[PDB]
């Protein structure tokens, strides 16, 4: 398999900030979801979830396809909850319809987390819509009640190594988990709509208690009303993940460097970009602009 990025005949940079700023708008004025919270945690997600069925070996999976459209894909029991990014952005692909779907999915991504304070993110379009059967079947992505081992083999899959797999991690910062959706409750600090490092100040300070959730599984619970999900708790078990995570709650800009960089290439995985390709852009924010 080979997946040639090929941009939308005739659209360029000036397109794509459109749709960035659409979207933008639209997180701006929906904020009262999941209890104000907005859409960007589920966005992130979004993005994240449809470039984590990549499979490094045979390149099947990954976002080029737009396969979330479909419905063994749609229906995963992993994406349980990301359907109300989806709808969000329905309207948004209704506005710019030569836009494809993976090129929309993972832009919104892109919006939220730049739009949240986090940093640039630099993206690339050409991601080609395609058909039903190219979509990976379910169980491509990790569950939540492992140890650093499955985690490191798990990510390993998707070309990343340990400082990627921490950086990536940082993202949990945002939003909550929900009981309804994976089996686990709770948001892991208080700036859940604001990108920072506070997953990392998180694990590493507060007083984590082991505890089984209403849906008996067990979550890391802490006094502050907190919690972390065993997988992100392994971030402090391993040794080797330890000292990033130290390294990140250190040092903001060196998170968010490296959050950048791993986010980008996560969503670009599986992906061959030609040699006459547009370089990747840099979209500015609505504040940038005076939006
Ligand atoms: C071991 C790896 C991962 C596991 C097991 C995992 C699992 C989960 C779980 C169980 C939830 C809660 C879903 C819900 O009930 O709504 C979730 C939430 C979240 N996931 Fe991950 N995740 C991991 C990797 C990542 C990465 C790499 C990203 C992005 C870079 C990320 C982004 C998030 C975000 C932003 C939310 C909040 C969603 C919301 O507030 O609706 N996760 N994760
Ligand atoms: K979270």
Same mark, same amino acid.
């Not at 499955?150 to 009981?179: C, I, P, S």
């Not at 709650?249 to 061959?272: C, M, P, V, W």
């Given at each position: 398999?080979?997946?040639?990025?090929?941009?939308?005949?005739?659209?360029?940079?000036?397109?794509?900030?459109?749709?960035?700023?659409?979207?933008?708008?639209?997180?701006?004025?929906?904020?009262?979801?999941?209890?104000?919270?907005?859409?960007?945690? #589920?966005?992130?997600?979004? &993005?994240?979830?449809?470039?984590? $069925?990549?499979? @490094?070996?045979?390149?099947?999976? %990954?976002?080029? *396809?737009?396969?979330?459209?479909?419905?063994?894909?749609?229906?995963?029991?992993?994406?349980?909850?990301?359907?109300?990014?989806?709808?969000?952005?329905?309207?948004?692909?209704?506005?710019?319809?030569?836009?494809?779907?993976?090129?929309?999915?993972?832009?919104?991504?892109?919006?939220?987390?730049?739009?949240?304070?986090?940093?640039?993110?630099?993206?690339?379009?050409?991601?080609?819509?395609?058909?039903?059967?190219?979509?990976?079947?379910?169980?491509?992505?990790?569950?939540?009640?492992?140890?650093?081992?499955?985690?490191?083999?798990?990510?390993?899959?998707?070309?990343?190594?340990?400082?990627?797999? #921490?950086?990536?991690?940082? &993202?949990?910062?945002?939003?909550? $988990?929900?009981? @309804?959706?994976?089996?686990?409750? %709770?948001?892991? *600090?208080?700036?859940?709509?604001?990108?920072?490092?506070?997953?990392?100040?998180?694990?590493?300070?507060?007083?984590?208690?082991?505890?089984?959730?209403?849906?008996?599984?067990?979550?890391?619970?802490?006094?502050?009303?907190?919690?972390?999900?065993?997988?992100?708790?392994?971030?402090?078990?391993?040794?080797?993940?330890?000292?990033?995570?130290?390294?990140?709650?250190?040092?903001?800009?060196?998170?968010?460097?490296?959050?950048?960089?791993?986010?980008?290439?996560?969503?670009?995985?599986?992906?061959?970009?030609?040699?006459?390709?547009?370089?990747?852009?840099?979209?500015?924010?609505?504040?940038?602009?005076?939006?």
């Amino acid at each position: 398999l080979v997946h040639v990025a090929s941009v939308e005949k005739g659209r360029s940079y000036e397109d794509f900030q459109k749709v960035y700023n659409a979207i933008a708008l639209k997180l701006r004025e929906d904020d009262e979801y999941d209890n104000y919270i907005g859409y960007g945690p #589920v966005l992130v997600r979004l &993005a994240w979830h449809i470039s984590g $069925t990549w499979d @490094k070996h045979d390149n099947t999976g %990954g976002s080029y *396809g737009g396969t979330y459209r479909f419905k063994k894909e749609f229906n995963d029991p992993s994406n349980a909850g990301l359907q109300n990014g989806f709808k969000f952005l329905e309207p948004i692909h209704k506005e710019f319809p030569w836009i494809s779907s993976g090129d929309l999915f993972s832009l919104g991504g892109v919006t939220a987390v730049q739009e949240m304070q986090g940093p640039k993110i630099p993206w690339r379009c050409g991601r080609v819509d395609t058909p039903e059967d190219t979509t990976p079947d379910n169980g491509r992505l990790p569950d939540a009640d492992k140890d650093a081992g499955y985690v490191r083999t798990f990510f390993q899959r998707l070309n990343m190594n340990d400082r990627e797999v #921490v950086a990536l991690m940082g &993202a949990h910062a945002l939003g909550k $988990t929900h009981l @309804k959706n994976s089996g686990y409750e %709770g948001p892991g *600090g208080a700036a859940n709509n604001v990108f920072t490092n506070e997953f990392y100040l998180n694990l590493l300070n507060e007083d984590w208690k082991l505890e089984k959730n209403d849906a008996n599984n067990e979550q890391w619970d802490s006094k502050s009303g907190y919690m972390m999900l065993p997988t992100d708790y392994s971030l402090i078990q391993d040794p080797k993940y330890l000292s990033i995570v130290k390294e990140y709650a250190n040092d903001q800009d060196k998170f968010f460097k490296d959050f950048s960089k791993a986010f980008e290439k996560l969503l670009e995985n599986g992906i061959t970009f030609p040699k006459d390709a547009p370089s990747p852009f840099i979209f500015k924010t609505l504040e940038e602009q005076g939006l």
